[PDB]
Design a protein around this motif. Structure first.
Motif, PDB file in Angstrom:
ATOM      1  N   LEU A  18       0.817  -1.205   0.000  1.00  0.00           N
ATOM      2  CA  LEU A  18       0.000   0.000   0.000  1.00  0.00           C
ATOM      3  C   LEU A  18       0.866   1.278   0.000  1.00  0.00           C
ATOM      4  O   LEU A  18       0.536   2.223  -0.710  1.00  0.00           O
ATOM      5  N   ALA A  19       2.016   1.287   0.687  1.00  0.00           N
ATOM      6  CA  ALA A  19       3.032   2.344   0.604  1.00  0.00           C
ATOM      7  C   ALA A  19       3.552   2.531  -0.836  1.00  0.00           C
ATOM      8  O   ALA A  19       3.661   3.654  -1.333  1.00  0.00           O
ATOM      9  N   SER A  20       3.824   1.421  -1.533  1.00  0.00           N
ATOM     10  CA  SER A  20       4.199   1.395  -2.952  1.00  0.00           C
ATOM     11  C   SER A  20       3.105   2.002  -3.848  1.00  0.00           C
ATOM     12  O   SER A  20       3.393   2.812  -4.735  1.00  0.00           O
ATOM     13  N   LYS A  21       1.829   1.682  -3.581  1.00  0.00           N
ATOM     14  CA  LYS A  21       0.674   2.240  -4.304  1.00  0.00           C
ATOM     15  C   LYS A  21       0.456   3.729  -4.000  1.00  0.00           C
ATOM     16  O   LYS A  21       0.059   4.486  -4.882  1.00  0.00           O
ATOM     17  N   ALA A  22       0.758   4.169  -2.779  1.00  0.00           N
ATOM     18  CA  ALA A  22       0.695   5.569  -2.368  1.00  0.00           C
ATOM     19  C   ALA A  22       1.538   6.449  -3.301  1.00  0.00           C
ATOM     20  O   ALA A  22       1.022   7.381  -3.920  1.00  0.00           O
ATOM     21  N   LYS A  27       2.953  10.195  -7.571  1.00  0.00           N
ATOM     22  CA  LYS A  27       3.853  10.557  -8.680  1.00  0.00           C
ATOM     23  C   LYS A  27       3.189  10.577 -10.069  1.00  0.00           C
ATOM     24  O   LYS A  27       3.763  11.137 -11.005  1.00  0.00           O
ATOM     25  N   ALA A  28       1.984  10.020 -10.212  1.00  0.00           N
ATOM     26  CA  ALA A  28       1.154  10.162 -11.421  1.00  0.00           C
ATOM     27  C   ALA A  28       0.388  11.507 -11.444  1.00  0.00           C
ATOM     28  O   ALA A  28      -0.276  11.860 -12.421  1.00  0.00           O
ATOM     29  N   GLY A  29       0.488  12.247 -10.339  1.00  0.00           N
ATOM     30  CA  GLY A  29      -0.237  13.435  -9.924  1.00  0.00           C
ATOM     31  C   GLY A  29      -1.751  13.336 -10.040  1.00  0.00           C
ATOM     32  O   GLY A  29      -2.431  14.300 -10.401  1.00  0.00           O
ATOM     33  N   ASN A  30      -2.275  12.152  -9.694  1.00  0.00           N
ATOM     34  CA  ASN A  30      -3.708  11.933  -9.499  1.00  0.00           C
ATOM     35  C   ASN A  30      -4.173  12.788  -8.313  1.00  0.00           C
ATOM     36  O   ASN A  30      -5.264  13.357  -8.356  1.00  0.00           O
ATOM     37  N   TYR A  31      -3.317  12.874  -7.279  1.00  0.00           N
ATOM     38  CA  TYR A  31      -3.518  13.553  -5.995  1.00  0.00           C
ATOM     39  C   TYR A  31      -4.984  13.413  -5.533  1.00  0.00           C
ATOM     40  O   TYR A  31      -5.696  14.390  -5.302  1.00  0.00           O
ATOM     41  N   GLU A  32      -5.439  12.163  -5.435  1.00  0.00           N
ATOM     42  CA  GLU A  32      -6.801  11.789  -5.040  1.00  0.00           C
ATOM     43  C   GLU A  32      -6.756  10.709  -3.945  1.00  0.00           C
ATOM     44  O   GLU A  32      -6.952  11.006  -2.766  1.00  0.00           O
ATOM     45  N   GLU A  33      -6.445   9.462  -4.308  1.00  0.00           N
ATOM     46  CA  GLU A  33      -6.284   8.341  -3.370  1.00  0.00           C
ATOM     47  C   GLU A  33      -4.937   8.364  -2.611  1.00  0.00           C
ATOM     48  O   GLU A  33      -4.840   7.841  -1.504  1.00  0.00           O
ATOM     49  N   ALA A  34      -3.910   9.017  -3.163  1.00  0.00           N
ATOM     50  CA  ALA A  34      -2.549   9.110  -2.629  1.00  0.00           C
ATOM     51  C   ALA A  34      -2.510   9.396  -1.119  1.00  0.00           C
ATOM     52  O   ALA A  34      -2.013   8.574  -0.354  1.00  0.00           O
ATOM     53  N   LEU A  35      -3.071  10.531  -0.687  1.00  0.00           N
ATOM     54  CA  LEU A  35      -3.124  10.962   0.723  1.00  0.00           C
ATOM     55  C   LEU A  35      -3.497   9.831   1.696  1.00  0.00           C
ATOM     56  O   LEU A  35      -2.747   9.552   2.633  1.00  0.00           O
ATOM     57  N   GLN A  36      -4.628   9.154   1.462  1.00  0.00           N
ATOM     58  CA  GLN A  36      -5.091   8.070   2.333  1.00  0.00           C
ATOM     59  C   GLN A  36      -4.181   6.835   2.271  1.00  0.00           C
ATOM     60  O   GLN A  36      -4.033   6.139   3.271  1.00  0.00           O
ATOM     61  N   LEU A  37      -3.492   6.589   1.153  1.00  0.00           N
ATOM     62  CA  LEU A  37      -2.505   5.506   1.064  1.00  0.00           C
ATOM     63  C   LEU A  37      -1.268   5.809   1.923  1.00  0.00           C
ATOM     64  O   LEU A  37      -0.802   4.951   2.673  1.00  0.00           O
ATOM     65  N   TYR A  38      -0.767   7.043   1.884  1.00  0.00           N
ATOM     66  CA  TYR A  38       0.371   7.468   2.704  1.00  0.00           C
ATOM     67  C   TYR A  38       0.126   7.302   4.214  1.00  0.00           C
ATOM     68  O   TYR A  38       0.979   6.752   4.915  1.00  0.00           O
ATOM     69  N   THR A  67       8.381   7.361   8.955  1.00  0.00           N
ATOM     70  CA  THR A  67       8.661   8.780   9.212  1.00  0.00           C
ATOM     71  C   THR A  67       8.627   9.632   7.936  1.00  0.00           C
ATOM     72  O   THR A  67       8.263  10.806   7.993  1.00  0.00           O
ATOM     73  N   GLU A  68       8.944   9.055   6.773  1.00  0.00           N
ATOM     74  CA  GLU A  68       8.801   9.745   5.484  1.00  0.00           C
ATOM     75  C   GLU A  68       7.342   9.725   5.011  1.00  0.00           C
ATOM     76  O   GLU A  68       6.815  10.765   4.625  1.00  0.00           O
ATOM     77  N   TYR A  69       6.649   8.582   5.082  1.00  0.00           N
ATOM     78  CA  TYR A  69       5.286   8.463   4.550  1.00  0.00           C
ATOM     79  C   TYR A  69       4.263   9.379   5.248  1.00  0.00           C
ATOM     80  O   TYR A  69       3.389   9.944   4.590  1.00  0.00           O
ATOM     81  N   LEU A  70       4.410   9.615   6.555  1.00  0.00           N
ATOM     82  CA  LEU A  70       3.572  10.567   7.299  1.00  0.00           C
ATOM     83  C   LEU A  70       3.886  12.045   7.005  1.00  0.00           C
ATOM     84  O   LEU A  70       3.028  12.907   7.198  1.00  0.00           O
ATOM     85  N   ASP A  71       5.095  12.347   6.530  1.00  0.00           N
ATOM     86  CA  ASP A  71       5.556  13.705   6.216  1.00  0.00           C
ATOM     87  C   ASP A  71       5.213  14.076   4.768  1.00  0.00           C
ATOM     88  O   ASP A  71       4.705  15.162   4.490  1.00  0.00           O
ATOM     89  N   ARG A  72       5.463  13.146   3.841  1.00  0.00           N
ATOM     90  CA  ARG A  72       5.252  13.328   2.392  1.00  0.00           C
ATOM     91  C   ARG A  72       3.784  13.539   2.004  1.00  0.00           C
ATOM     92  O   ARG A  72       3.513  14.225   1.018  1.00  0.00           O
TER      93      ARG A  72
END
Length: 81
Positions: A18-22, A27-38, A67-72
């Motif tokens: 799920l981190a990989s899918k985030a 990086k596809a700049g969908n910026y939709e599902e990304a946030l909740q995956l991170y 620590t990166e996934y919660l910041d990014r």
């Protein structure tokens, strides 16, 4: 066969998938599902590190990534639909 299950928990396996899918959504700049995956990635990594740890010091492996996934996620909030 072994397929990481011999050495890696099902929670840790989930967390990384799920981190990989985030990153894939981000990086596809969908910026939709990304946030909740991170955030969902670290929800599992912290449930592993605090309750299901392994290899004494080796638990530090997730601490570096989580620590990166919660910041990014805070960078997505600029354009997150």
């Amino acid at each position: 066969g072994s397929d990481h299950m011999s050495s890696t928990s099902p929670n840790l396996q989930k967390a990384i998938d799920l981190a990989s899918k985030a990153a894939q959504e981000d990086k596809a700049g969908n910026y939709e599902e990304a946030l909740q995956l991170y955030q969902h990635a670290v929800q599992y990594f912290l449930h592993v590190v605090k309750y299901e740890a392994q290899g004494d010091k080796a638990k530090q492996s997730i601490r570096a990534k989580c620590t990166e996934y919660l910041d990014r996620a805070e960078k997505l909030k600029e354009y997150l639909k």
